[PDB]
Amino acid sequence: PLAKDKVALLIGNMNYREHPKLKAPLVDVYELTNLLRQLDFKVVSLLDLTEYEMRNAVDEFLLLLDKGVYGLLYYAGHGYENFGNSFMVPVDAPNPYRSENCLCVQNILKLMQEKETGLNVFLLDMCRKTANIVFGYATCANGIFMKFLKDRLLEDKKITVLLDEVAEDMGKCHLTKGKQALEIRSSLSEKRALTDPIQGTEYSAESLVRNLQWAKAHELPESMCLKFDCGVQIQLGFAAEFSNVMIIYTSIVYKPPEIIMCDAYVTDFPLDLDIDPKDANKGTPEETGSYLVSKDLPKHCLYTRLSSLQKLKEHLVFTVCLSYQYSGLEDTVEDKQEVNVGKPLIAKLDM
Numbered sequence: 001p002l003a004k005d006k007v008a009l010l011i012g013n014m015n016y017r018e019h020p021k022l023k024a025p026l027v028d029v030y031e032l033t034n035l036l037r038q039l040d041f042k043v044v045s046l047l048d049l050t051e052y053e054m055r056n057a058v059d060e061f062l063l064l065l066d067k068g069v070y071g072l073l074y075y076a077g078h079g080y081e082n083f084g085n086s087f088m089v090p091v092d093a094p095n096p097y098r099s100e101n102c103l104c105v106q107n108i109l110k111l112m113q114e115k116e117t118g119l120n121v122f123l124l125d126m127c128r129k130t131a132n133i134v135f136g137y138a139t140c141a142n143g144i145f146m147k148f149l150k151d152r153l154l155e156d157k158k159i160t161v162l163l164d165e166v167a168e169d170m171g172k173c174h175l176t177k178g179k180q181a182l183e184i185r186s187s188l189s190e191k192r193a194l195t196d197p198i199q200g201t202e203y204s205a206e207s208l209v210r211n212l213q214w215a216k217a218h219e220l221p222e223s224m225c226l227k228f229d230c231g232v233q234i235q236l237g238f239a240a241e242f243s244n245v246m247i248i249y250t251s252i253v254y255k256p257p258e259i260i261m262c263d264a265y266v267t268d269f270p271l272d273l274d275i276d277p278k279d280a281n282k283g284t285p286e287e288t289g290s291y292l293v294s295k296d297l298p299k300h301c302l303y304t305r306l307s308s309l310q311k312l313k314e315h316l317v318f319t320v321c322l323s324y325q326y327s328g329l330e331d332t333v334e335d336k337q338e339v340n341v342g343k344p345l346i347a348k349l350d351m
């Protein structure tokens with residue numbers, strides 16, 4: 001059994017404006033991304049999406065579901081049931097909910113039902129109120145579903161057999177023991193698995209430009225070295241937590257011996273990103289809201305988390321500031337430099 005290609009769209013909503021926050025989507029989408037990438041899936045991981053951003057992400061994902069393709073869609077966040085229908089709640093939903101402002105699962109399923117895909121796995125991990133589709137619906141540090149799913153996902157068995165084993169894991173767990181926490185709906189008529197290889201990777205112009213636009217939509221700005229007149233050199237580094245989340249970190253690489261102190265800090269970011277200056281320039285990545293890529297970031301820097309890159313409609317332009325003092329000097333001099341790192345990650349798509 002072969003896949004024409006393997007694409008995945010992972011969405012996690014946690015920072016709700018009018019509803020309770022959720023912690024699990026953060027680690028769950030992060031761990032699911034690495035595992036799916038290990039299975040040779042091109043992944044798009046998005047955190048905290050409004051209604052229009054979800055509708056654009058899901059439509060574009062469905063466009064990739066050509067004949068023979070293996071697709072996986074995963075959602076983690078608020079959801080609600082309204083007369084037999086299930087809805088995914090965007091971070092911009094009002095309180096109380098209105099179905100119109102949410103994404104109907106049954107509408108998406110109907111759209112997937114028209115594809116001639118090899119495998120279509122749709123996972124819903126919600127906090128509640130042939131197309132070879134395998135729908136998984138969960139209604140419950142990782143969340144319960146991902147804790148059991150992450151331990152089985154790399155198994156070389158049929159996805160239905162694999163998800164059925166997870167249902168049995170969850171049924172033994174003292175938390176969801178004897179509870180209706182997982183439903184699996186399936187129309188899989190053949191032996192497909194998330195581990196199946198991709199057919200002979202060939203030079204077809206249409207699939208190569210979508211693979212290279214996916215590569216382009218995940219390009220980070222390269223390392224930067226800014227030199228100030230005083231002789232101080234600052235390095236700007238960039239890391240990615242999600243397709244729409246980039247960390248920026250600064251360090252002083254060189255400081256002249258005659259300079260007693262030098263503090264580098266970034267400010268004046270485009271207002272679409274809504275970066276609070278009290279959350280930027282922290283001594284640890286955890287202080288910025290970054291708890292996953294923290295172990296892979298270089299130490300003893302100043303960190304700023306840029307979430308909401310899907311909202312950036314212009315070039316990422318910001319100021320790098322430097323406060324410094326010389327030997328014997330009673331006054332602290334201030335100097336600045338403007339930086340333009342293009343449109344990083346998902347911002348390349350022109351939102």
Ligand SMILES: COC[C@H]1COCCN1c1c(NC(=O)Nc2ccc(OC)c(Cl)c2)cnc2cc(C)nn12
Pocket residue numbers: 006007008009042043044046049052053054056057058060061063064210213214217310349351
């Ligand atoms: C058409 O495919 C384009 C490809 C290539 O570039 C990366 C994005 N792509 C996508 C998306 N797309 C989106 O998420 N689009 C998006 C648009 C507007 C938005 O905000 C207004 C947001 Cl938040 C998202 C979704 N699933 C997948 C899965 C794969 C393998 N790629 N892929």
Ligand SMILES: [Mg+2]
Pocket residue numbers: 102103104105107
């Ligand atoms: Mg809808």
